[PDB]
Amino acid sequence: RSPPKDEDDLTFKLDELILDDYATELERKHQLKKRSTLQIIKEELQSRYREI
Amino acid sequence: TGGVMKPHRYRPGTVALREIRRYQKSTELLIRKLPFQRLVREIAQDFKTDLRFQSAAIGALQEASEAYLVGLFEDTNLCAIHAKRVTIMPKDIQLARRIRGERA
Amino acid sequence: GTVALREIRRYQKSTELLIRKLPFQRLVREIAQDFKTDLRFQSAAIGALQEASEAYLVGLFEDTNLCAIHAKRVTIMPKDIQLARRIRGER
Amino acid sequence: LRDNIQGITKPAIRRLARRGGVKRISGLIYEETRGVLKVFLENVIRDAVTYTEHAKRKTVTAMDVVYALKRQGRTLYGFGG
Amino acid sequence: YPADKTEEALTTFKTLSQNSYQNKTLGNAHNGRSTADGMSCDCEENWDTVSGINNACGEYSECINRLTSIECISGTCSCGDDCQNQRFQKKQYAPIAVFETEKKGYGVRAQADIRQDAFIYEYLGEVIDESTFRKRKENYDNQGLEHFYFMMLQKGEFIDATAKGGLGRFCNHSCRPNAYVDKWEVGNKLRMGIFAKREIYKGEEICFDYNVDRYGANPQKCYCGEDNCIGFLGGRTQTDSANILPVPIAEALGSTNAQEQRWVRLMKEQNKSIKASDYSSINEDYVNSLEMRPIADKDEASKVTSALLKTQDYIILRKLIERVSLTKDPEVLKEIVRLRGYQCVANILTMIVLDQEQQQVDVESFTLSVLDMLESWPNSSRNRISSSQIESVLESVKTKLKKIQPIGKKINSLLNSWSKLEISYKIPKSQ
Ligand SMILES: Nc1ncnc2c1ncn2[C@@H]1O[C@H](CSCC[C@H](N)C(=O)O)[C@@H](O)[C@H]1O
Ligand SMILES: [Zn+2]
Ligand SMILES: [Zn+2]
Ligand SMILES: [Zn+2]
């Protein structure tokens, strides 16, 4: 509702996330291999339905 | 949401300066007639009773007392202004009476 | 400060005139000249004028000291002079 | 008549001070103004009373009041002086 | 910046150039007493021959009428015509624009830099009596309007800015305003002007304090964004029995306008002392005598959290904690967890059982009355506690009151239960 200077949305904060530790904890707790899925989610959140 | 915004209050001195202009423009008596008449009778009772007081004598006494009090307050305002204040105090009244010679 | 109290005590205990006679005499003659010329003066009239002016100035200085005391000061100022004169009724 | 010095009420003395150009009023001044008004009224009333007593009368007239005031250097115009 | 909405705002109402009167008697100065000796300033007219402008009665001039909030009238004052103290009559408003705000709707912004004490804009509207005001207020409440449009010109005389008025109706409330409303006398009439409290730059919003009398209306939350905001729009309520404690705090205790009425009606009218409206001093007897009912609404839980963050009184906190003990709705408790109720309960403990303004037995009763719901609330992760670290406070208070063994054993059970919980995983961030 109040984007910062020269930014359309807060999707740029996703690049600070450490997806590797999140994938490791997901694999430990739930036995899910989701390392590529976090990257796909990040790319889709940064730009919804790009032209691939 | 039917509330009312309030007009707030005046600053201290604005209504004071207004009423200053109003009382300095108009000339009516500021002391109530009947309490002043009772006070004059109370003072006169201390010397000799059964003393009737004509209306013109009471009016002359009221006019003289108002003139004296207005002059004393003008002098006391000058005293307060001299002491870098805007509020008059009893010490200015006593000093004004002292320099005027009324108080020894 | 000490010699101020010494002077106050000495002059308040003394009774002789503090204004010098000859300058005051010349001042009186100079003032009186412009009302009428070739004016003669008795000595007693000049002495009476001196005594009255000294008494008046002493009273004015006392009231001025009171005015100076009012303003939380110890030094008298010209504004005290015109305050005392204004309240006393001189113009 | 018992202690009617309070009849000189606080708004009235405020008005009297206000005519003199005074902007602010201390809370302790009212008793002082009542006292000085009592003193002045006492003096003028005393002089008027002895003026009336010399005249062999029982009622103080305006002429005695104006005479007493003029004798105190407070000459009043408008009341038959 | 935000797009201009000046014409769009103007189309929403009938624009007025001057105040309209329901009748010729209303709005007259001195309660209708015509001062035939109108107050004429002694200023000499100062005409600048180059510009042909009469500079008399200016801002830095010594015009007595200007100081006393009275406007000069042409043909009656020595200042002459077109003096610099005819701001209302000449309608010399400051240049302003309307812009749409994020939450407050339309708002007024300064199109130019405006000096201190400068006249901004004359508040315009219809001058109406009290009965007409009541009728219009009832009609607008039926219409569901969520905006104030009434200002008190004086006692018994109001100004309505709903259907007809000026740009001043779009000014929004600020708890630290840059402008203020003042009352002035123009001729035999009374006007309400808006003056600059400070120096205002171009583009900045122009705001004034509403100081609004609710007349019994419900509070409206204030979204001004000022740091000194009280959180609600309001002002001194009805003359007596209207409030004993602040609303959020009163509604936190389950009290309402009726319960705040009832206590004062039962005692003040029967020769027992209740002080004036002031929330700096808490009356413990009212809080003890208040009735308590369980909470089942999340806004009431938010008001409870605000009361915990605000009130310092021992007795109000006791009764709020007792009401929480009666409360058993899990969703309200989850909301309190989201509001971090444990954080507030830590300070509530500390003020009473670490700072000692009370007696040890009563503090022990308080501690036993506050450990129970802490034992009872649903908990699933120490991330909840980590937002408060209330366990540290519990250790400090069991160590201080070690002689009172029931408190120690209850805190033992509580920390044993809490230590079984895991911690919610939080994704590490790059550094
Ligand atoms: N700081 C603030 N926070 C929330 N609402 C506000 C506000 N200042 C003003 N308002 C709202 O605006 C009303 C005053 S009328 C102001 C113009 C109106 N909002 C409009 O755009 O048409 C108030 O009654 C309130 O409902
Ligand atoms: Zn003027
Ligand atoms: Zn003018
Ligand atoms: Zn606010």
Swiss-Prot record, chain B:
The modification Phosphothreonine is found at T49, T76. The modification N6-glutaryllysine is found at K25, K48, K84, K91. Its main location: nucleus. The gene is H3-3A. The chain holds residues 33 to 136 of 136 of the full protein. It comes from Homo sapiens. This is Histone H3.3. The modification N6-(2-hydroxyisobutyryl)lysine is found at M5, K25, K33, K48, K91. The modification N6-acetyllysine is found at M5, K25, K48, K84, K91. Changing H8Y: In BRYLIB1; uncertain significance. GO terms for molecular function: nucleosomal DNA binding; protein heterodimerization activity; RNA polymerase II cis-regulatory region sequence-specific DNA binding; RNA polymerase II core promoter sequence-specific DNA binding; structural constituent of chromatin.
Curated annotation (Swiss-Prot), chain D:
Changing L16P: In TEBIVANED3; results in early developmental defects when expressed in zebrafish embryos. There is a cross-link at K10, K38, K58, K70 (Glycyl lysine isopeptide (Lys-Gly) (interchain with G-Cter in SUMO2)). Changing P11L: In TEBIVANED1. The modification N6-butyryllysine is found at K10, K23, K56, K58, K70. GO terms for cellular component: CENP-A containing nucleosome; chromosome, telomeric region; extracellular exosome; extracellular region; membrane; nucleoplasm; nucleosome; nucleus. The modification N6-(2-hydroxyisobutyryl)lysine is found at K10, K23, K38, K56, K58, K70. One of its GO terms (molecular function) is RNA binding. Keywords: Acetylation, Chromosomal rearrangement, Chromosome, Citrullination, Disease variant, DNA-binding, Hydroxylation, Intellectual disability, Isopeptide bond, Methylation, Nucleosome core, Nucleus, Phosphoprotein, Ubl conjugation. The keyword Phosphoprotein applies. Changing E42Q: In a breast cancer sample; somatic mutation. Changing K10R: Abolished ufmylation. One of its GO terms (biological process) is protein localization to CENP-A containing chromatin. The modification N6-(beta-hydroxybutyryl)lysine is found at K10, K56, K70. Changing K70R: In TEBIVANED1; results in severe early developmental defects when expressed in zebrafish embryos; results in defective cell cycle progression when expressed in zebrafish embryos. Changing R19L: In TEBIVANED4; results in early developmental defects when expressed in zebrafish embryos. The modification N6-lactoyllysine is found at K10, K56, K70. It is found in: Nucleus; Chromosome. It comes from the Eukaryota. Belongs to the histone H4 family. It is linked to Tessadori-Bicknell-Van Haaften neurodevelopmental syndrome 1: An autosomal dominant disorder with onset in infancy, characterized by poor overall growth, microcephaly, hypotonia, profound global developmental delay, impaired intellectual development, poor or absent speech, and characteristic dysmorphic facial features, including hypertelorism and abnormal nose. Other variable neurologic and systemic features may also occur. The nucleosome is a histone octamer containing two molecules each of H2A, H2B, H3 and H4 assembled in one H3-H4 heterotetramer and two H2A-H2B heterodimers. The octamer wraps approximately 147 bp of DNA. Found in a co-chaperone complex with DNJC9, MCM2 and histone H3.3-H4 dimers. Within the complex, interacts with DNJC9 (via C-terminus); the interaction is direct. Interacts with NASP; NASP is a histone chaperone that stabilizes and maintains a soluble pool of Histone H3-H4 dimers. This is Histone H4. It comes from Homo sapiens. The chain holds residues 23 to 103 of 103 of the full protein.
